[PDB]
Amino acid sequence: PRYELALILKAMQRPETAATLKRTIEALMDRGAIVRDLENLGERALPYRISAHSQQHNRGGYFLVDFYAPTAAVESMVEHLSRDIDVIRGNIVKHPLTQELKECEGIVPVPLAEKLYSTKKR
Amino acid sequence: REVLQLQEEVKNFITRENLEARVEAALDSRKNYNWAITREGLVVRPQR
Amino acid sequence: TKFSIYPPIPGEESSLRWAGKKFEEIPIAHIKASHNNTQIQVVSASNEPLAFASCGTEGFRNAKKGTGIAAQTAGIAAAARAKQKGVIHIRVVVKGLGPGRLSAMHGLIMGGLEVISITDNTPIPHXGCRPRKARKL
Amino acid sequence: YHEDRIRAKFYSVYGSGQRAFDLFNPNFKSTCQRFVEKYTELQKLGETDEEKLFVETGKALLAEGVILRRVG
Amino acid sequence: KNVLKIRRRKMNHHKYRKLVKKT
Amino acid sequence: SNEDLPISMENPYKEPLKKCILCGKHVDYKNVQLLSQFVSPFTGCIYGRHITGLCGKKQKEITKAIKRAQIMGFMPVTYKDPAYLKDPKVCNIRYRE
Amino acid sequence: RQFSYLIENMARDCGEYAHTRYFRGGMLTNARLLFGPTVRLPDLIIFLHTLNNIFEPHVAVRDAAKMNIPTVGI
Amino acid sequence: DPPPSTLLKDYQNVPGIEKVDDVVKRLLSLEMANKKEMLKIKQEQFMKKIVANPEDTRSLEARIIALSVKIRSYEEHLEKHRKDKAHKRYLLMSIDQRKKMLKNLRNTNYDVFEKICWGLGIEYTFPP
Amino acid sequence: AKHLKFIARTVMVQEGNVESAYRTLNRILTMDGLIEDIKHRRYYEKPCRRRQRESYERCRRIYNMEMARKINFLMRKNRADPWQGC
RNA sequence: AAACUCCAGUUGACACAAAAUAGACUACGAAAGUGGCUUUAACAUAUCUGAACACACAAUAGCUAAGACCCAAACUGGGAUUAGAUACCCCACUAUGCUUAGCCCUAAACCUCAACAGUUAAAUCAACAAAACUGCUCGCCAGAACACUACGAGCCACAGCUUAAAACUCAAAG
Numbered sequence: 001p002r003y004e005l006a007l008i009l010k011a012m013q014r015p016e017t018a019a020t021l022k023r024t025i026e027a028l029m030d031r032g033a034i035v036r037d038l039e040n041l042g043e044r045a046l047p048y049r050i051s052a053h054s055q056q057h058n059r060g061g062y063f064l065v066d067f068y069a070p071t072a073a074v075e076s077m078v079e080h081l082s083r084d085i086d087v088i089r090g091n092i093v094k095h096p097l098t099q100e101l102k103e104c105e106g107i108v109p110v111p112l113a114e115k116l117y118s119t120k121k122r
Numbered sequence: 123r124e125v126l127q128l129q130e131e132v133k134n135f136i137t138r139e140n141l142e143a144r145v146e147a148a149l150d151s152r153k154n155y156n157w158a159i160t161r162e163g164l165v166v167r168p169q170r
Numbered sequence: 171t172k173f174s175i176y177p178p179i180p181g182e183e184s185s186l187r188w189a190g191k192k193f194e195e196i197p198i199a200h201i202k203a204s205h206n207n208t209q210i211q212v213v214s215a216s217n218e219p220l221a222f223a224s225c226g227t228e229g230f231r232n233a234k235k236g237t238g239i240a241a242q243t244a245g246i247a248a249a250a251r252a253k254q255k256g257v258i259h260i261r262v263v264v265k266g267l268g269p270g271r272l273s274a275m276h277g278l279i280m281g282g283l284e285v286i287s288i289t290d291n292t293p294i295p296h297x298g299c300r301p302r303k304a305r306k307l
Numbered sequence: 308y309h310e311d312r313i314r315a316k317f318y319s320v321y322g323s324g325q326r327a328f329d330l331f332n333p334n335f336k337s338t339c340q341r342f343v344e345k346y347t348e349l350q351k352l353g354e355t356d357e358e359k360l361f362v363e364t365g366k367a368l369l370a371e372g373v374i375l376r377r378v379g
Numbered sequence: 380k381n382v383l384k385i386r387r388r389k390m391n392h393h394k395y396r397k398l399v400k401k402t
Numbered sequence: 403s404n405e406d407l408p409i410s411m412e413n414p415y416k417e418p419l420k421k422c423i424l425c426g427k428h429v430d431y432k433n434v435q436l437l438s439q440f441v442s443p444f445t446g447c448i449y450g451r452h453i454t455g456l457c458g459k460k461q462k463e464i465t466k467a468i469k470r471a472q473i474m475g476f477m478p479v480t481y482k483d484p485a486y487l488k489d490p491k492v493c494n495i496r497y498r499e
Numbered sequence: 500r501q502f503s504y505l506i507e508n509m510a511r512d513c514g515e516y517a518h519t520r521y522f523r524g525g526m527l528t529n530a531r532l533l534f535g536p537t538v539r540l541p542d543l544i545i546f547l548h549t550l551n552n553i554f555e556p557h558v559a560v561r562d563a564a565k566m567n568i569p570t571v572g573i
Numbered sequence: 574d575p576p577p578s579t580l581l582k583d584y585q586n587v588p589g590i591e592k593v594d595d596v597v598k599r600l601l602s603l604e605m606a607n608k609k610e611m612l613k614i615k616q617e618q619f620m621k622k623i624v625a626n627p628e629d630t631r632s633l634e635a636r637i638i639a640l641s642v643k644i645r646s647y648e649e650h651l652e653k654h655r656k657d658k659a660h661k662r663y664l665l666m667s668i669d670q671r672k673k674m675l676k677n678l679r680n681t682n683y684d685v686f687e688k689i690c691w692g693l694g695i696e697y698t699f700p701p
Numbered sequence: 702a703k704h705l706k707f708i709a710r711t712v713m714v715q716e717g718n719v720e721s722a723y724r725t726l727n728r729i730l731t732m733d734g735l736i737e738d739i740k741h742r743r744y745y746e747k748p749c750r751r752r753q754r755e756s757y758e759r760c761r762r763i764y765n766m767e768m769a770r771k772i773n774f775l776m777r778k779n780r781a782d783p784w785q786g787c
Numbered sequence: 788a789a790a791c792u793c794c795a796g797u798u799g800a801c802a803c804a805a806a807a808u809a810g811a812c813u814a815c816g817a818a819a820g821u822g823g824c825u826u827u828a829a830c831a832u833a834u835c836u837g838a839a840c841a842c843a844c845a846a847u848a849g850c851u852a853a854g855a856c857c858c859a860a861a862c863u864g865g866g867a868u869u870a871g872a873u874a875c876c877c878c879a880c881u882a883u884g885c886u887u888a889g890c891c892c893u894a895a896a897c898c899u900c901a902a903c904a905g906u907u908a909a910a911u912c913a914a915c916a917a918a919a920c921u922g923c924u925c926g927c928c929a930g931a932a933c934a935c936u937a938c939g940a941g942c943c944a945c946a947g948c949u950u951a952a953a954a955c956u957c958a959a960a961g
């Protein structure tokens with residue numbers, strides 16, 4: 001199916017960041033993936049201190065990778081990311097654009113519940 | 123119709139030949155998914 | 171400009187300076203308001219112990235330590251040991267819902283120290299370790 | 308009634324005008340009611356669409372001197 | 380509703396479990 | 403017979419059903435600027451549908467997106483990102499007074 | 500209470516009676532004790548308001564049917 | 574088992590899909606789909622092979638075929654998840670519901686009862 | 702621990718008014734629910750007991766929210782008697 | 788009081804444990820039960836009822852084997868209270884709670900209110916509770932106690948579970 005790889009790389013120079021992206025995308029193609037795009041969300045400060053591969057990170061580069069791949073290639077790709085030191089954190093999720101949103105009409109009011117107790121003189 | 127639309131997009135997919143070129147381009151652009159909303163249900167995208 | 175109750179963020183420069191110092195350089199007063207005691211410890215921005223006081227160190231024993239008098243007495247003793255080192259403005263960090271949660275803050279004001287901010291660091295787990303069983307008293 | 312569809316649209320397009328109702332007077336005609344009479348009279352002519360028929364009704368009142376301030 | 384009929388069965392079971400442990 | 407009798411008709415004056423501010427919009431876990439509009443500036447706690455004003459179907463989407471962005475490294479847990487403190491307030495809660 | 504004065508006047512004008520006040524228990528079923536053994540009860544009762552001030556039926560509606568008195572009601 | 578290169582049930586019929594790019598044919602295959610798309614094709618094969626009118630799906634025959642594809646799916650899921658007691662109950666009930674279909678079919682149309690038992694490899698066993 | 706310090710549950714003092722700040726801080730924790738949550742987490746509340754309390758707290762909210770809706774609906778009749786004497 | 792005092796506080800590093808807020812939502816599942824994130828597989832039946840001759844499940848506790856161990860904690864020890872306290876309160880610690888492979892098969896397993904279909908009128912209706920009824924089917928109950936017992940039989944269960952009486956006794960029990 002169609003997946004999305006939320007990748008958080010390490011704060012590195014451009015020469016090293018390009019080698020990691022290419023290294024990471026070649027791993028997807030080797031497992032039967034069909035990459036579609038490579039979006040960059042920019043280098044920002046992490047919401048909290050992340051510790052990975054005996055390193056305390058405070059900044060990182062956010063990159064997205066939309067691609068198609070079989071179901072059996074997800075588990076094999078999650079292991080590769082773990083070994084890579086440059087990758088602080090990487091997770092795969094089903095692409096949100098492959099989930100049609102049912103049209104909504106509006107909020108339906110709910111009337112108070114009636115006939116919960118017998119109409120007897122207590 | 124879906125197949126035809128897909129047959130056009132496949133040209134833009136990354137490949138081993140154009141992999142290096144696409145990487146550099148991504149390092150030059152930026153995508154912003156951040157946008158707020160008001161009480162009137164109106165999107166407010168940041169001026170950046 | 172206006173006044174905001176939100177503290178200044180280190181990343182963003184601010185115009186609020188106390189005695190020519192930034193919000194980050196201000197020393198910190200860690201208060202631990204327990205149910206039977208109240209410890210106070212003042213530190214600098216670089217985590218350097220300046221003064222330490224507690225209801226026990228002031229002479230109170232057993233149940234008399236879990237009062238607002240012993241907490242205030244401990245705040246005055248911590249504000250007198252830190253004022254000798256050049257401490258005027260502090261950032262309070264309370265931890266716990268004990269009796270001396272507010273009374274200790276008063277003793278610091280009665281020792282010549284000015285409180286610019288109040289931070290709550292009470293430990294709440296998001297689940298965590300299972301507490302002891304409920305009492306029948 | 309059949310004219311309730313007309314009133315619902317008039318109040319939405321224009322809304323109750325400055326003129327205040329006089330419920331005491333039995334033979335009282337409101338600005339909206341006057342709009343219904345014309346709207347229906349033009350329907351007798353043969354127009355079969357609401358949009359054109361609705362628009363033509365407002366013009367007739369404006370010619371008669373009625374004040375029709377739309378919400379916009 | 381009271382538990383007087385549960386209390387009769389409570390002692391019956393307790394005395395029986397205590398008698399088996401003894402024999 | 404008579405023509406003044408009422409007719410079997412649906413209510414013309416009935417008003418359209420109300421919609422939440424997010425009706426028809428896509429909630430994504432990367433839009434931290436939108437997700438921070440529904441958390442406490444001080445504790446980072448998620449607000450309820452009686453404060454946000456959202457419907458059940460959309461309040462569940464904001465929650466699942468916040469919990470996903472917090473553990474992925476996009477959004478903080480204990481506090482609201484100061485960068486989004488000057489954003490339009492859509493929640494019906496007043497702390498100071 | 501809004502129409503208590505109006506009704507009391509009408510009864511006086513038409514030479515009839517009115518009871519617009521709090522209805523004490525036994526005005527009809529226990530009348531002989533309240534008024535006297537030779538008292539004469541109404542032959543017709545007219546209810547201009549069949550409800551009391553708590554939005555419940557007036558007690559006289561039931562007490563009149565007990566004493567076989569016909570009632571007229573709005 | 575349908576090969577992975579097989580196209581989806583929906584996309585095989587559209588015209589012009591015979592001459593397209595190889596990448597577009599690999600995205601519309603069973604390789605880039607879930608397990609439930611391969612089962613929609615397994616069912617299609619049995620209908621043409623066994624049922625007289627493939628289009629009709631409400632007939633007692635088709636219901637047996639639709640259910641026999643689910644039974645095989647549960648056995649492949651239980652071969653890897655032995656401690657999944659939920660799917661082990663759906664299997665034993667589905668096997669009992671198919672037997673109730675085969676009983677009503679053997680009592681009405683014995684000519685087709687033999688066809689389904691042969692096509693799907695089923696052996697009706699009289700209960701003890 | 703891993704988050705930035707002095708950004709959560711922090712309140713600044715205005716004109717050395719510590720009292721007004723402490724009341725504000727204690728009102729933010731109460732409205733968010735931390736205060737009550739910290740008190741129940743002192744001793745372990747077993748599931749059965751926690752499910753009995755949530756049902757009690759939810760039935761109290763309903764009743765208290767409907768009575769107040771009737772008080773504000775009848776407060777309009779708290780005026781003087783217009784038919785004084787009848 | 789005892790205990791601790793290679794303790795306490797600030798900071799940093801740091802889980803095979805447990806899963807704030809959202810939830811004022813009321814969803815999923817046959818029930819048990821299920822509320823941190825991601826992915827994979829995946830939630831029977833085109834009439835209904837239907838197995839206490841069978842099959843598959845079944846909270847917690849507990850048994851067997853191998854591991855993990857922050858915290859909690861039967862047992863036990865100490866302190867205190869008490870006429871005594873084998874308890875209620877305080878401290879410490881163990882089995883156990885977790886993982887894996889098997890067993891055990893119990894509950895106020897109760898929303899004590901069976902499944903399918905259908906009704907709101909008549910006598911609505913002992914009382915209380917969560918208003919009163921129809922059709923059809925399966926299951927179950929026939930005074931209290933003896934009795935979640937004895938015997939018999941079956942079961943990886945051996946101080947066990949399931950099925951389950953009798954004699955004597957009472958004029959009440961409920």
Ligand code: FES
Pocket residue numbers: 104105106107420421422424425426456457459460
């Ligand atoms: S009302 Fe349409 S999505 Fe909330």
Ligand SMILES: [K+]
Pocket residue numbers: 897
């Ligand atoms: K119950």
Ligand SMILES: [Mg+2]
Pocket residue numbers: 380
């Ligand atoms: Mg009672």
Ligand SMILES: [Mg+2]
Pocket residue numbers: 387390391
């Ligand atoms: Mg007994």
Ligand SMILES: [Mg+2]
Pocket residue numbers: 837
């Ligand atoms: Mg059945």
Ligand SMILES: [Mg+2]
Pocket residue numbers: none
């Ligand atoms: Mg059964």
Ligand SMILES: [Mg+2]
Pocket residue numbers: 845892
């Ligand atoms: Mg069990």
Ligand SMILES: [Mg+2]
Pocket residue numbers: none
């Ligand atoms: Mg165990």
Ligand SMILES: [Mg+2]
Pocket residue numbers: none
């Ligand atoms: Mg312990």
Ligand SMILES: [Mg+2]
Pocket residue numbers: none
């Ligand atoms: Mg002892």
Ligand SMILES: [Mg+2]
Pocket residue numbers: none
């Ligand atoms: Mg242990």
Ligand SMILES: [Mg+2]
Pocket residue numbers: 883884
């Ligand atoms: Mg346990």
Ligand SMILES: [Mg+2]
Pocket residue numbers: none
């Ligand atoms: Mg239960």
Ligand SMILES: [Mg+2]
Pocket residue numbers: 899
């Ligand atoms: Mg029962």
Ligand SMILES: [Mg+2]
Pocket residue numbers: 901902
């Ligand atoms: Mg049944």
Ligand SMILES: [Mg+2]
Pocket residue numbers: none
């Ligand atoms: Mg009996």
